[PDB]
Amino acid sequence: SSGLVPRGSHMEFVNKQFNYKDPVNGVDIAYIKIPMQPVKAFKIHNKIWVIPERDTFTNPEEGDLNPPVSYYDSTYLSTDNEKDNYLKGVTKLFERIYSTDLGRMLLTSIVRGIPFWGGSTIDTELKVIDTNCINVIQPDGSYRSEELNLVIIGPSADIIQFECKSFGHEVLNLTRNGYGSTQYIRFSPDFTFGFEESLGAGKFATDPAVTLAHELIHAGHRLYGIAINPNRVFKEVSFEELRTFGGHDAKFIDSLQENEFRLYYYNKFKDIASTLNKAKSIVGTTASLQYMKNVFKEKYLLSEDTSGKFSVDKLKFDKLYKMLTEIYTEDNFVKFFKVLNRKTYLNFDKAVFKINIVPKVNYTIYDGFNLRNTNLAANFNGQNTEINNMNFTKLK
Numbered sequence: 001s002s003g004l005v006p007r008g009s010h011m012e013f014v015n016k017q018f019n020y021k022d023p024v025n026g027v028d029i030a031y032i033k034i035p036m037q038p039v040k041a042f043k044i045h046n047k048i049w050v051i052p053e054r055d056t057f058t059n060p061e062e063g064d065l066n067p068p069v070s071y072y073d074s075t076y077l078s079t080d081n082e083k084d085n086y087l088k089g090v091t092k093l094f095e096r097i098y099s100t101d102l103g104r105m106l107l108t109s110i111v112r113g114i115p116f117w118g119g120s121t122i123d124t125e126l127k128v129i130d131t132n133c134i135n136v137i138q139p140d141g142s143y144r145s146e147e148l149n150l151v152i153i154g155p156s157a158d159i160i161q162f163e164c165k166s167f168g169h170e171v172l173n174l175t176r177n178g179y180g181s182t183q184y185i186r187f188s189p190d191f192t193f194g195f196e197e198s199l200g201a202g203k204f205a206t207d208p209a210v211t212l213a214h215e216l217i218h219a220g221h222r223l224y225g226i227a228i229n230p231n232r233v234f235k236e237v238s239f240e241e242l243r244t245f246g247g248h249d250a251k252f253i254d255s256l257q258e259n260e261f262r263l264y265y266y267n268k269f270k271d272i273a274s275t276l277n278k279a280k281s282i283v284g285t286t287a288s289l290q291y292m293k294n295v296f297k298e299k300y301l302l303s304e305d306t307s308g309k310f311s312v313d314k315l316k317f318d319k320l321y322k323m324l325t326e327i328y329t330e331d332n333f334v335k336f337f338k339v340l341n342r343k344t345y346l347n348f349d350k351a352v353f354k355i356n357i358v359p360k361v362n363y364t365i366y367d368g369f370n371l372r373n374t375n376l377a378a379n380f381n382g383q384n385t386e387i388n389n390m391n392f393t394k395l396k
Protein backbone atom coordinates (compact mmCIF):
# COMPACT_ATOMS: atom_id res chain seq x y z
CA SER A 1 0.00 0.00 0.00
CA SER A 2 1.14 3.51 -0.98
CA GLY A 3 -0.69 5.59 1.66
CA LEU A 4 -1.79 8.18 -0.90
CA VAL A 5 -4.84 9.16 1.21
CA PRO A 6 -3.81 9.26 4.89
CA ARG A 7 -6.93 11.31 5.70
CA GLY A 8 -10.26 11.56 3.98
CA SER A 9 -11.58 9.53 1.08
CA HIS A 10 -9.66 10.98 -1.87
CA MET A 11 -6.44 12.76 -2.71
CA GLU A 12 -6.75 16.50 -2.20
CA PHE A 13 -4.66 17.75 -5.12
CA VAL A 14 -4.09 14.87 -7.54
CA ASN A 15 -7.38 14.15 -9.24
CA LYS A 16 -7.07 10.38 -9.77
CA GLN A 17 -5.27 7.38 -8.34
CA PHE A 18 -3.72 6.51 -11.68
CA ASN A 19 -2.07 3.27 -12.74
CA TYR A 20 0.32 3.45 -15.67
CA LYS A 21 -1.67 0.76 -17.49
CA ASP A 22 -5.01 2.53 -16.98
CA PRO A 23 -6.62 2.89 -20.45
CA VAL A 24 -6.22 6.13 -22.37
CA ASN A 25 -9.38 8.22 -22.47
CA GLY A 26 -8.51 11.61 -24.12
CA VAL A 27 -9.19 13.61 -20.96
CA ASP A 28 -6.77 12.81 -18.12
CA ILE A 29 -4.94 9.76 -19.55
CA ALA A 30 -3.84 10.39 -23.12
CA TYR A 31 -1.19 10.08 -25.77
CA ILE A 32 0.12 13.63 -26.22
CA LYS A 33 2.56 15.49 -28.44
CA ILE A 34 4.79 18.35 -27.29
CA PRO A 35 5.03 21.26 -29.76
CA MET A 36 7.98 12.89 -32.32
CA GLN A 37 5.90 9.83 -31.51
CA PRO A 38 3.13 10.46 -28.95
CA VAL A 39 3.84 9.64 -25.33
CA LYS A 40 1.38 8.36 -22.73
CA ALA A 41 0.68 11.08 -20.15
CA PHE A 42 -1.48 11.67 -17.07
CA LYS A 43 -3.29 14.88 -16.13
CA ILE A 44 -2.90 15.03 -12.36
CA HIS A 45 -4.62 18.44 -11.96
CA ASN A 46 -6.02 21.34 -13.96
CA LYS A 47 -3.02 22.70 -15.95
CA ILE A 48 -0.58 19.98 -14.80
CA TRP A 49 0.50 16.85 -16.66
CA VAL A 50 2.96 14.06 -15.83
CA ILE A 51 4.91 12.27 -18.58
CA PRO A 52 6.56 9.25 -16.94
CA GLU A 53 9.30 9.00 -19.57
CA ARG A 54 12.94 9.96 -19.82
CA ASP A 55 13.07 13.39 -21.45
CA THR A 56 14.32 12.88 -25.00
CA PHE A 57 11.84 15.44 -26.37
CA THR A 58 12.21 18.96 -25.03
CA ASN A 59 15.81 19.46 -26.23
CA PRO A 60 16.68 18.14 -29.72
CA GLU A 61 20.42 17.91 -29.02
CA GLU A 62 19.58 15.75 -25.97
CA GLY A 63 17.58 13.12 -27.87
CA ASP A 64 19.66 10.20 -26.56
CA LEU A 65 20.37 8.87 -23.08
CA ASN A 66 24.01 8.13 -23.83
CA PRO A 67 26.53 9.40 -21.27
CA PRO A 68 29.13 11.81 -22.67
CA VAL A 69 28.10 15.42 -9.80
CA SER A 70 26.17 13.40 -12.38
CA TYR A 71 24.74 9.93 -12.73
CA TYR A 72 23.89 7.93 -15.84
CA ASP A 73 21.80 4.81 -16.46
CA SER A 74 20.18 4.53 -19.90
CA THR A 75 17.85 1.71 -18.76
CA TYR A 76 16.19 3.69 -15.96
CA LEU A 77 12.46 4.29 -16.54
CA SER A 78 12.26 2.07 -19.63
CA THR A 79 9.74 -0.48 -18.29
CA ASP A 80 6.08 -0.14 -17.40
CA ASN A 81 6.58 -1.10 -13.74
CA GLU A 82 9.04 1.78 -13.44
CA LYS A 83 6.72 4.27 -15.16
CA ASP A 84 3.94 3.21 -12.82
CA ASN A 85 6.22 3.69 -9.82
CA TYR A 86 7.34 7.05 -11.16
CA LEU A 87 3.76 8.22 -11.56
CA LYS A 88 2.79 7.08 -8.07
CA GLY A 89 5.90 8.65 -6.55
CA VAL A 90 5.32 12.03 -8.19
CA THR A 91 1.64 11.76 -7.15
CA LYS A 92 2.76 11.08 -3.61
CA LEU A 93 5.08 14.10 -3.53
CA PHE A 94 2.41 16.48 -4.82
CA GLU A 95 0.14 15.26 -2.03
CA ARG A 96 2.99 15.71 0.47
CA ILE A 97 3.57 19.23 -0.78
CA TYR A 98 -0.17 19.96 -0.69
CA SER A 99 -0.54 18.67 2.88
CA THR A 100 1.33 21.78 4.07
CA ASP A 101 -0.14 25.27 4.12
CA LEU A 102 2.81 26.61 2.13
CA GLY A 103 2.41 23.99 -0.57
CA ARG A 104 -1.27 24.64 -1.02
CA MET A 105 -0.42 28.31 -1.51
CA LEU A 106 2.34 27.59 -4.05
CA LEU A 107 0.40 25.03 -6.09
CA THR A 108 -2.64 27.32 -6.17
CA SER A 109 -0.40 30.14 -7.46
CA ILE A 110 1.04 27.75 -10.07
CA VAL A 111 -2.39 26.64 -11.28
CA ARG A 112 -3.61 30.25 -11.57
CA GLY A 113 -0.43 31.32 -13.40
CA ILE A 114 -1.69 30.69 -16.95
CA PRO A 115 0.89 31.80 -19.54
CA PHE A 116 -0.12 35.12 -21.07
CA TRP A 117 -1.89 35.25 -24.44
CA GLY A 118 0.80 37.44 -25.98
CA GLY A 119 1.33 35.63 -29.23
CA SER A 120 -0.18 38.02 -31.77
CA THR A 121 1.72 40.36 -34.08
CA ILE A 122 -1.31 42.69 -33.87
CA ASP A 123 -1.14 44.53 -30.59
CA THR A 124 -4.95 44.76 -30.37
CA GLU A 125 -5.43 40.99 -30.72
CA LEU A 126 -5.02 38.43 -27.95
CA LYS A 127 -3.64 35.11 -29.18
CA VAL A 128 -2.26 32.07 -27.44
CA ILE A 129 1.40 31.12 -27.81
CA ASP A 130 1.58 27.63 -29.35
CA THR A 131 4.47 26.45 -27.21
CA ASN A 132 2.33 26.88 -24.08
CA CYS A 133 0.12 23.97 -25.23
CA ILE A 134 0.29 20.25 -25.85
CA ASN A 135 -1.68 18.23 -28.36
CA VAL A 136 -3.93 15.68 -26.65
CA ILE A 137 -5.09 12.69 -28.63
CA GLN A 138 -8.61 11.38 -28.04
CA PRO A 139 -9.67 7.72 -28.12
CA ASP A 140 -11.27 8.20 -31.56
CA GLY A 141 -7.88 9.55 -32.71
CA SER A 142 -8.39 13.27 -33.17
CA TYR A 143 -6.22 15.97 -31.58
CA ARG A 144 -7.18 18.93 -29.49
CA SER A 145 -4.90 21.68 -28.29
CA GLU A 146 -4.81 22.09 -24.53
CA GLU A 147 -3.17 24.95 -22.68
CA LEU A 148 -1.20 23.86 -19.64
CA ASN A 149 1.08 25.37 -17.06
CA LEU A 150 3.32 22.54 -15.90
CA VAL A 151 4.69 19.21 -17.11
CA ILE A 152 6.62 16.86 -14.81
CA ILE A 153 8.84 14.59 -16.93
CA GLY A 154 11.65 12.14 -16.35
CA PRO A 155 15.27 13.25 -16.53
CA SER A 156 17.30 13.23 -19.73
CA ALA A 157 20.73 11.54 -19.90
CA ASP A 158 21.98 12.82 -16.51
CA ILE A 159 19.44 11.30 -14.14
CA ILE A 160 20.15 13.76 -11.31
CA GLN A 161 20.13 16.96 -13.35
CA PHE A 162 16.76 18.22 -12.18
CA GLU A 163 15.65 21.56 -13.60
CA CYS A 164 12.75 23.73 -14.66
CA LYS A 165 12.93 24.69 -18.31
CA SER A 166 10.58 26.03 -20.96
CA PHE A 167 10.27 26.78 -24.62
CA GLY A 168 11.49 30.22 -25.65
CA HIS A 169 10.17 32.77 -28.11
CA GLU A 170 11.96 34.23 -31.10
CA VAL A 171 11.83 37.74 -29.60
CA LEU A 172 9.94 37.69 -26.30
CA ASN A 173 11.60 36.52 -23.06
CA LEU A 174 8.53 34.91 -21.57
CA THR A 175 10.10 34.01 -18.21
CA ARG A 176 11.21 37.60 -17.52
CA ASN A 177 8.60 39.89 -19.15
CA GLY A 178 5.68 38.92 -16.90
CA TYR A 179 4.03 36.71 -19.56
CA GLY A 180 5.08 33.29 -18.36
CA SER A 181 5.37 30.06 -20.31
CA THR A 182 4.58 26.41 -19.77
CA GLN A 183 7.19 24.89 -17.47
CA TYR A 184 8.80 21.47 -17.94
CA ILE A 185 10.37 20.02 -14.80
CA ARG A 186 12.89 17.23 -15.29
CA PHE A 187 12.64 15.27 -12.03
CA SER A 188 12.77 11.74 -10.63
CA PRO A 189 11.21 10.56 -7.34
CA ASP A 190 13.35 7.45 -7.61
CA PHE A 191 16.77 8.99 -6.73
CA THR A 192 18.01 11.59 -4.22
CA PHE A 193 21.21 13.31 -3.10
CA GLY A 194 23.29 13.02 0.04
CA PHE A 195 24.56 15.81 2.26
CA GLU A 196 26.66 15.60 5.41
CA GLU A 197 25.54 17.04 8.71
CA SER A 198 26.53 16.71 12.35
CA LEU A 199 23.67 16.59 14.85
CA GLY A 200 30.79 12.27 14.10
CA ALA A 201 29.33 13.68 10.91
CA GLY A 202 26.27 11.99 9.49
CA LYS A 203 25.41 11.03 5.90
CA PHE A 204 21.83 12.09 5.23
CA ALA A 205 19.52 12.07 2.24
CA THR A 206 17.59 15.02 0.86
CA ASP A 207 13.82 14.55 1.11
CA PRO A 208 12.61 14.44 -2.53
CA ALA A 209 9.53 16.52 -1.57
CA VAL A 210 11.98 19.39 -0.86
CA THR A 211 13.69 18.89 -4.24
CA LEU A 212 10.38 18.87 -6.09
CA ALA A 213 9.19 21.96 -4.18
CA HIS A 214 12.40 23.73 -5.21
CA GLU A 215 11.71 23.12 -8.89
CA LEU A 216 8.09 24.13 -8.43
CA ILE A 217 9.23 27.42 -6.91
CA HIS A 218 11.24 28.10 -10.07
CA ALA A 219 8.14 27.23 -12.08
CA GLY A 220 6.14 29.80 -10.14
CA HIS A 221 8.72 32.47 -10.92
CA ARG A 222 8.74 31.53 -14.60
CA LEU A 223 4.92 31.17 -14.93
CA TYR A 224 4.57 34.79 -13.67
CA GLY A 225 7.51 35.89 -15.86
CA ILE A 226 9.53 37.25 -12.94
CA ALA A 227 12.59 34.96 -13.11
CA ILE A 228 15.96 36.64 -12.61
CA ASN A 229 18.19 36.71 -15.68
CA PRO A 230 20.51 33.68 -15.42
CA ASN A 231 23.44 36.07 -16.10
CA ARG A 232 23.12 37.55 -12.59
CA VAL A 233 25.42 35.26 -10.59
CA PHE A 234 27.77 35.06 -7.61
CA LYS A 235 31.14 33.61 -8.65
CA GLU A 236 28.70 30.29 -10.49
CA VAL A 237 25.52 30.40 -8.40
CA SER A 238 22.72 32.47 -9.94
CA PHE A 239 20.63 34.96 -8.02
CA GLU A 240 17.63 32.91 -9.18
CA GLU A 241 18.98 29.86 -7.32
CA LEU A 242 19.79 31.88 -4.19
CA ARG A 243 16.29 33.36 -4.17
CA THR A 244 14.67 29.96 -4.65
CA PHE A 245 16.69 28.39 -1.84
CA GLY A 246 15.75 31.22 0.45
CA GLY A 247 16.82 31.54 4.05
CA HIS A 248 19.99 33.49 4.75
CA ASP A 249 21.29 32.61 1.28
CA ALA A 250 18.72 35.05 -0.13
CA LYS A 251 19.84 37.89 2.15
CA PHE A 252 23.01 38.06 0.06
CA ILE A 253 21.15 39.54 -2.90
CA ASP A 254 21.79 43.19 -2.02
CA SER A 255 18.41 44.68 -1.11
CA LEU A 256 18.72 47.70 -3.39
CA GLN A 257 19.05 45.20 -6.23
CA GLU A 258 15.81 43.56 -5.07
CA ASN A 259 13.92 46.86 -5.18
CA GLU A 260 15.27 47.42 -8.69
CA PHE A 261 14.00 43.96 -9.70
CA ARG A 262 10.61 44.57 -8.08
CA LEU A 263 10.14 47.90 -9.88
CA TYR A 264 11.13 46.29 -13.20
CA TYR A 265 8.54 43.54 -12.95
CA TYR A 266 5.94 46.00 -11.63
CA ASN A 267 6.38 47.95 -14.87
CA LYS A 268 6.14 44.72 -16.87
CA PHE A 269 2.84 43.94 -15.14
CA LYS A 270 1.70 47.45 -16.08
CA ASP A 271 2.60 46.72 -19.71
CA ILE A 272 0.40 43.62 -19.45
CA ALA A 273 -2.48 45.66 -18.02
CA SER A 274 -2.43 48.09 -20.92
CA THR A 275 -2.13 45.31 -23.46
CA LEU A 276 -5.33 43.96 -21.95
CA ASN A 277 -6.83 47.46 -22.21
CA LYS A 278 -5.81 48.06 -25.85
CA ALA A 279 -7.17 44.62 -26.81
CA LYS A 280 -10.05 44.64 -29.32
CA SER A 281 -10.17 41.07 -30.69
CA ILE A 282 -9.29 37.49 -29.84
CA VAL A 283 -8.40 34.60 -32.15
CA GLY A 284 -8.13 30.87 -31.78
CA THR A 285 -10.91 30.47 -29.25
CA THR A 286 -14.66 30.42 -28.83
CA ALA A 287 -14.27 32.43 -25.60
CA SER A 288 -14.88 36.16 -25.63
CA LEU A 289 -12.19 38.81 -25.35
CA GLN A 290 -13.73 39.95 -22.05
CA TYR A 291 -13.52 36.43 -20.60
CA MET A 292 -9.82 35.96 -21.39
CA LYS A 293 -9.14 39.45 -20.08
CA ASN A 294 -10.61 38.25 -16.81
CA VAL A 295 -8.50 35.12 -16.67
CA PHE A 296 -5.49 37.48 -16.69
CA LYS A 297 -7.10 40.00 -14.35
CA GLU A 298 -7.35 37.06 -11.97
CA LYS A 299 -3.79 35.83 -12.57
CA TYR A 300 -2.02 39.15 -12.00
CA LEU A 301 -4.53 40.48 -9.42
CA LEU A 302 -5.38 43.49 -11.56
CA SER A 303 -7.84 46.13 -10.45
CA GLU A 304 -10.78 47.03 -12.69
CA ASP A 305 -12.50 50.41 -12.59
CA THR A 306 -16.14 51.17 -13.41
CA SER A 307 -15.13 51.68 -17.06
CA GLY A 308 -13.79 48.12 -17.16
CA LYS A 309 -10.19 49.36 -17.45
CA PHE A 310 -7.49 47.26 -15.75
CA SER A 311 -4.54 48.50 -13.70
CA VAL A 312 -1.89 47.20 -11.31
CA ASP A 313 -2.52 47.97 -7.65
CA LYS A 314 0.80 48.51 -5.88
CA LEU A 315 -0.22 46.66 -2.72
CA LYS A 316 -1.56 43.64 -4.61
CA PHE A 317 1.57 43.48 -6.79
CA ASP A 318 3.87 43.57 -3.75
CA LYS A 319 1.75 40.84 -2.14
CA LEU A 320 1.93 38.53 -5.16
CA TYR A 321 5.59 39.29 -5.83
CA LYS A 322 6.56 38.72 -2.20
CA MET A 323 4.68 35.41 -2.12
CA LEU A 324 6.36 34.11 -5.26
CA THR A 325 9.88 35.26 -4.38
CA GLU A 326 10.19 35.46 -0.58
CA ILE A 327 7.58 33.12 0.92
CA TYR A 328 7.83 30.20 -1.53
CA THR A 329 11.41 29.05 -0.81
CA GLU A 330 13.10 25.73 -0.22
CA ASP A 331 14.11 26.84 3.25
CA ASN A 332 10.47 27.53 4.15
CA PHE A 333 9.41 24.11 2.88
CA VAL A 334 12.12 22.56 5.05
CA LYS A 335 10.60 24.33 8.05
CA PHE A 336 7.05 23.17 7.19
CA PHE A 337 8.14 19.58 6.49
CA LYS A 338 10.36 19.52 9.64
CA VAL A 339 13.00 17.59 7.70
CA LEU A 340 16.77 17.85 7.63
CA ASN A 341 18.22 19.69 4.64
CA ARG A 342 21.46 21.28 3.53
CA LYS A 343 21.79 24.69 5.17
CA THR A 344 23.07 26.55 2.09
CA TYR A 345 22.58 26.09 -1.64
CA LEU A 346 26.11 24.85 -2.36
CA ASN A 347 26.54 22.35 0.50
CA PHE A 348 25.42 19.20 -1.33
CA ASP A 349 27.57 16.06 -1.65
CA LYS A 350 28.51 14.04 -4.70
CA ALA A 351 26.47 11.17 -3.21
CA VAL A 352 23.49 9.73 -5.08
CA PHE A 353 21.01 7.20 -3.71
CA LYS A 354 18.30 4.97 -5.17
CA ILE A 355 15.10 5.18 -3.12
CA ASN A 356 11.50 4.02 -3.37
CA ILE A 357 9.06 6.36 -1.65
CA VAL A 358 5.90 4.66 -2.95
CA PRO A 359 5.36 1.99 -0.25
CA LYS A 360 4.00 3.66 2.87
CA VAL A 361 6.29 1.53 5.03
CA ASN A 362 9.15 3.52 3.42
CA TYR A 363 7.82 7.08 3.18
CA THR A 364 4.62 8.90 4.04
CA ILE A 365 2.86 12.04 2.99
CA TYR A 366 2.96 13.41 6.54
CA ASP A 367 6.42 12.32 7.75
CA GLY A 368 8.55 11.69 4.66
CA PHE A 369 11.18 9.15 5.71
CA ASN A 370 10.98 10.06 9.41
CA LEU A 371 8.11 7.77 10.32
CA ARG A 372 6.30 8.72 13.51
CA ASN A 373 6.26 6.29 16.42
CA THR A 374 9.33 4.48 15.03
CA ASN A 375 13.04 4.86 15.72
CA LEU A 376 13.15 6.88 12.47
CA ALA A 377 10.92 9.55 14.05
CA ALA A 378 13.70 11.16 16.06
CA ASN A 379 16.95 12.90 15.12
CA PHE A 380 15.95 12.69 11.43
CA ASN A 381 16.91 9.03 11.62
CA GLY A 382 14.70 8.22 8.65
CA GLN A 383 16.90 10.38 6.43
CA ASN A 384 20.13 9.04 7.94
CA THR A 385 21.51 6.78 5.19
CA GLU A 386 23.26 4.52 7.70
CA ILE A 387 20.48 4.04 10.24
CA ASN A 388 17.64 3.78 7.69
CA ASN A 389 19.91 2.00 5.23
CA MET A 390 17.09 -0.22 3.94
CA ASN A 391 15.70 2.87 2.18
CA PHE A 392 18.88 4.11 0.48
CA THR A 393 21.09 2.28 -2.02
CA LYS A 394 24.29 4.21 -2.68
CA LEU A 395 25.21 4.46 -6.36
CA LYS A 396 27.94 7.11 -6.62
Ligand SMILES: [Zn+2]
Pocket residue numbers: 214218241244
Ligand atom coordinates in the same frame (compact mmCIF):
# COMPACT_ATOMS: atom_id res chain seq x y z
ZN1 LIG B 1 17.25 25.57 -8.69
